Structure formats: C-alpha cells, structure tokens
Design a protein around this ligand. Structure first.
Ligand SMILES: [Er+3]
Ligand SMILES: [Er+3]
Ligand SMILES: [Er+3]
Ligand SMILES: [Er+3]
Ligand SMILES: [Er+3]
Ligand SMILES: [Er+3]
Ligand SMILES: [Er+3]
Lengths: 176, 174
DNA sequence: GGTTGCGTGACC
DNA sequence: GGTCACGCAACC
C-alpha cells in the first residue's frame, strides 16, 4: 500500500537520525522513536545556545573534565526540564543521560527537597550578584544509596538563549 | 460492558503520542534553516546532524562547550601535572577568569611554585603513588582558596589493567 | 501519489 | 500506561 511506504520512509529517517546521535550504540538501538526526536532536539538546542555564548590535548580536555569532576553537570530550565545532564550522571546516580534529558527534573528529586529546588529555579541582569545558587538537595539514586543520594548543587543561574528568552540554572553536583 | 470507554481512554493516550510526536517536529523545525511537510523536516534534520559531524568518543558537548560550562557554573579550570616531579603538563585557558596570569607562569612552571610554601609538604603527600584524590590548597592570585578534585591517569581498552599524572580541575572553594 | 490526523488491536 | 503498526477518510 501507499500508506505503508509513507510510514516506512518516514521511519528510515528516524533510524538514520538516531544512529547519528552522540551516545553509545548500546543505548541508541534501544531508543524509543519519541525519545529519538525529543533528545535529538535537546542536542540542537544545546548547540545553538553554545554558538551564541561562545561566539594535542585540547581534545582530551572534555573527557578529562567529566571524569576529574567529583560529580556531574546539570542544566535546567524554568520549565524545570533538564537541558543537559553530563555523561557522568550515570557514575554517581545510575541514570543514563540518554533517559534524563528533556525529562522533568522533579522525577529525580525527593518530595521534601522538591519544594526547595522549585524555589531555587525562580528567584535580573546577566551576571548579577543575586541568583548565585549553592543549595543542598537529595536526588534519587539507583546504586547499591538506599535511594535518595544526598548531594549539593553549586551553580550560577544565568539567562538561557537560542530557544524560541528564558532563564536557566547551570550548576555542578557535589556529592558530600 | 462499557469497556469502549476505557478503550476510548486508550485513544486519548495514543493521541498524545501524536501531539508529542508532532510537537517535536515543530520543535525540531525551529533549530534548522527554516522558520511544511514533516518528512521534509526530518530529512533536513538529518542533514543538519551530519553537518555537525577503532575507539572514538562521541559527545553531547565538545571540549569548548564543557570547558565553558564548568567555567560558568563553578569557576573551575583543568590542569594535568606530573604525579611526582612538580611539573605542569597542561592548563586550560579557563585559568584567566578564575585566576590571572594565564599560560605563562603556569605553562612550564612546577605546580609547587603556584601554591603556598606551607602547602608543599601537604601536597607531596597526595602524590605518593604507593586512585582518586581531592584536596584544597591556596593558589597564587595575592592568594585564593582553591578546591581541587580529580583522578590519577598515567602518561606513557585492555582486558585487565593499565610515571603518572594528576588530572584534576580546580575551582574556587565556597 | 503526497501528507495530517483518527480510532483500533496486538504486544510489552 | 505505553509503543508500534495498521487501516481508514480527508485533503492538496
Ligand atoms: Er517513551
Ligand atoms: Er574531545
Ligand atoms: Er523526612
Ligand atoms: Er472486548
Ligand atoms: Er562565577
Ligand atoms: Er612565574
Ligand atoms: Er584485550
């Protein structure tokens, strides 16, 4: 039929796109078709924002940055959606970044601390003295933990561009 | 015998799959060279992706994007130093907003020269090499409190195991 | 022949 | 609770 070709050639592009994503093959192949799109736009959003803001070991640098840090990096929006979760989130919380991005941050936070976090999202010029955030919060953990691993977000909330003028929390997770 | 209702709630669910599907296409059409057929938007999206880009490491974010990000959220800079001889191996350009004097008196100088005198003895203890080390020290420009976190990697994928070096990042303590 | 949406069912 | 694949009725 012609509808079967419709859906088919509509799928092959999702498969190619997925294969182009910047994750290990282990996770790429188990990606839900919706996830493909969702995170695939998360990628482009990050690239745009970094192009506007940023407008041989230099390569090894990134890798070194992820491992050398005692925790992981988090970028959330006022919509309370993980704009970014570094690969190392798996190393301390047992979550794969693939399934953390573009998912309600509140699905990682303890109910008690959920409120305080919601307050940390919303308090403003670019680099004010205000809205420097350094708060403690407990985040779900999947390691052998008792769930709710306690750690400490030290970060600097700043304006998020490239999306369409919303704010966002850019922070580091310090486990201790 | 009203199961049709609960199967009518099934419709509502499958519907959101569309909205979520379509809504992403629109989202995925705002990060592309356009303001249209969806399929076309997906082919153009593939094109965009391929334009952006043995063992090889993919990355959501490049070294510039991480370097920057860490430098924004925490005021952290990377440095690799030699695990015994106080010899610096590498320092990112992020040593300019955190501290000053980038890439001159840090380029070939010993890490012991960049710290306090009364911290040398407390530092060599970290570099015994007798897997992951973290500490705090006082760094030059007069002086600031720097929290250093990192791991040990050697400098010359196996099945069992791999002069060493301290690969760490230092950020202003708080 | 194209694509946009809709209500079903099987299969988890 | 959700995914994936049908087939259908529209319409350029
Ligand atoms: Er899903
Ligand atoms: Er790199
Ligand atoms: Er309690
Ligand atoms: Er029935
Ligand atoms: Er700062
Ligand atoms: Er000097
Ligand atoms: Er081997």
């Amino acid at each position: 039929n012609p509808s079967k070709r419709h859906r088919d050639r509509l799928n092959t592009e999702l498969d190619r796109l997925a294969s182009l994503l910047p994750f290990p093959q282990d996770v790429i192949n188990k990606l839900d078709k919706l996830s493909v799109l969702r995170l695939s736009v998360s990628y482009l959003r990050a690239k745009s924002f970094f192009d506007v803001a940023l407008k041989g070991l230099n390569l090894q640098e990134g890798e070194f940055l992820l491992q050398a840090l005692n925790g992981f990096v988090l970028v959330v929006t006022t919509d309370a959606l993980v704009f970014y979760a570094s690969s190392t989130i798996q190393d301390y919380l047992g979550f794969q970044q693939s399934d953390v991005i573009h998912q309600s941050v509140y699905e990682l936070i303890h109910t008690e601390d959920r409120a305080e976090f919601q307050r940390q999202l919303h308090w403003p010029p670019e680099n004010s003295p205000l809205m420097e955030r350094c708060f403690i919060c407990r985040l779900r953990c999947l390691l052998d933990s008792s769930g709710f691993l306690a750690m400490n977000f030290q970060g600097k909330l700043k304006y998020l561009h490239g999306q369409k003028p919303q704010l966002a929390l850019f922070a580091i997770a310090t486990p201790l | 015998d009203k199961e049709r209702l609960a199967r009518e709630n099934h419709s509502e669910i499958e519907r959101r799959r569309r909205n979520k599907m379509t809504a992403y296409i629109t989202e995925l059409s705002d990060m592309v060279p356009t303001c249209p057929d969806k399929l076309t938007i997906l082919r153009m999206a593939v094109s965009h992706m391929k334009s952006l880009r043995g063992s090889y490491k993919p990355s959501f974010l490049t070294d510039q994007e991480l370097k920057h990000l860490i430098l924004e959220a925490a005021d952290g800079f990377l440095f690799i130093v030699s695990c015994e001889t106080g010899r610096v191996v590498y320092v990112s350009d992020s040593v300019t907003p955190v501290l000053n004097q980038p890439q001159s008196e840090w380029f070939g100088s010993t890490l012991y020269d960049q710290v306090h005198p009364d911290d040398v003895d407390k530092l060599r203890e970290q570099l015994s090499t007798s897997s992951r080390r973290s500490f705090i020290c006082r760094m030059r420009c007069h002086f600031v409190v720097v929290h250093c976190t990192g791991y040990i990697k050697a400098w010359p994928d196996d099945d069992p195991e791999a002069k060493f070096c301290l690969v760490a990042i230092g950020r202003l303590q708080v």
